[PDB]
């Protein structure tokens, strides 16, 4: 039921006199593929354990975002740290145009068609966070109506 995927893995070192501990950072992301997305960032001495940790993290602290049928609702900019991301709604069946890491990120989310680009410098974790921020910002056609206290059709045209 839940789509789950590893994005990035780092060899991260806690240097000590007794010898530098070579530890593994794991970055995963889960989601049902219908709306909700949740990223998880787990680090451990081992790799599979780390990945499991990451998965667990992803499992809770999950962001619920509504989707325009099977695509993005509105041209949204998701910003985090140094990695600024522009994300655009794309036409029917054109595919997830996003990245090597970001494509995977959006795959779990459930967006079929997207036109997305990260700018400047892009760390995987950072980029995922940016995406998530963008998603959070992203609002449904009825939410905006509610905010306005208005009709959806009227808002549309």
């Amino acid at each position: 039921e839940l789509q789950e995927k590893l994005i990035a893995v780092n060899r991260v070192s806690k240097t000590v006199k007794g010898g530098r501990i070579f530890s593994f950072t794991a970055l995963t992301v889960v989601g049902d593929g219908n709306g909700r997305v949740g990223f998880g960032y787990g680090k451990a001495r081992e790799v599979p354990a780390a990945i499991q940790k990451a998965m667990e993290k992803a499992r809770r602290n999950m962001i619920n975002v509504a989707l325009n049928n099977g695509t993005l609702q509105h041209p949204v900019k998701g910003v985090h740290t140094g990695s600024r991301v522009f994300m655009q709604p794309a036409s029917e069946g054109t595919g997830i145009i996003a990245g090597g890491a970001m494509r995977a990120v959006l795959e779990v989310a459930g967006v079929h068609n997207v036109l997305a680009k990260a700018y400047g410098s892009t760390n995987p974790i950072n980029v995922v966070r940016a995406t998530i921020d963008g998603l959070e910002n992203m609002n449904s056609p009825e939410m905006v109506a509610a905010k306005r206290g208005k009709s959806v059709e009227e808002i549309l045209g």
Partner: protein, 204 residues
């Protein structure tokens, strides 16, 4: 314009029943489709995302028997066309005369169908075409010439077609050896194993 040599190697590399042979005999009994090509068969490394897309693309190319440049051209054409891009790409891929013939049941394999098309046997609209990449329009009647009606391989192909899956967008006749194109090929009729989106993403 075409690959020549070991053809089930391709699908072994993929790891899926790709229908790259006629298949009266089972695909697992004749070749070890479960295993990768060569020495490093039992080895199954963790495959990259780009890598998987590439593999999918290759699978698609294998399916039809289309080399890279031609495939690129097809993709471009699809992009040019209105609507679902992947679907459009699928449509003309199918629309290839040889592939249409294969679907009908006049060549038991896609390569075989291509060969038949080449060897002056397939006669669309009363004109025999050497070219396999002829895009077939709806409401077109393709006939097999009386010179080609002597062959038993065609009969075998027909039998295989009868045995296997039946397409809805095409009508095939056994004793008459006539085909009819009803509508443009769609994603609904074809199997869900194809990942057109991935290929599209790759071609950027």
């Amino acid at each position: 314009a075409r690959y020549l040599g070991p053809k089930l190697k391709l699908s072994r590399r993929e790891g899926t029943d790709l229908f790259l042979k006629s298949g009266v005999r089972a695909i697992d009994t004749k070749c070890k489709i479960e295993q990768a090509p060569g020495q490093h068969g039992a080895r199954k490394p963790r495959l990259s995302d780009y890598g998987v897309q590439l593999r999918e693309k290759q699978k698609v190319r294998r399916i039809y028997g289309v080399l890279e440049r031609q495939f690129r051209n097809y993709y471009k054409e699809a992009a040019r066309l209105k609507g679902n891009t992947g679907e459009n790409l699928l449509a003309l891929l199918e629309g290839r005369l040889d592939n249409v013939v294969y679907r009908m049941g006049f060549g038991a394999t896609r390569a075989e169908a291509r060969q038949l098309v080449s060897h002056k046997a397939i006669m669309v609209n009363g004109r025999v075409v050497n070219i396999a990449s002829y895009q077939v329009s709806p409401n077109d009647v393709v006939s097999i010439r009386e010179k080609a009606k002597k062959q038993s391989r065609v009969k075998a192909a027909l039998e295989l077609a009868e045995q296997r899956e039946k397409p809805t967008w095409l009508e095939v006749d056994a004793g008459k050896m006539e085909g009819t194109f009803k509508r443009k090929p769609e994603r609904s009729d074809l199997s869900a194993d194809i990942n057109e989106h991935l290929i599209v993403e790759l071609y950027s």
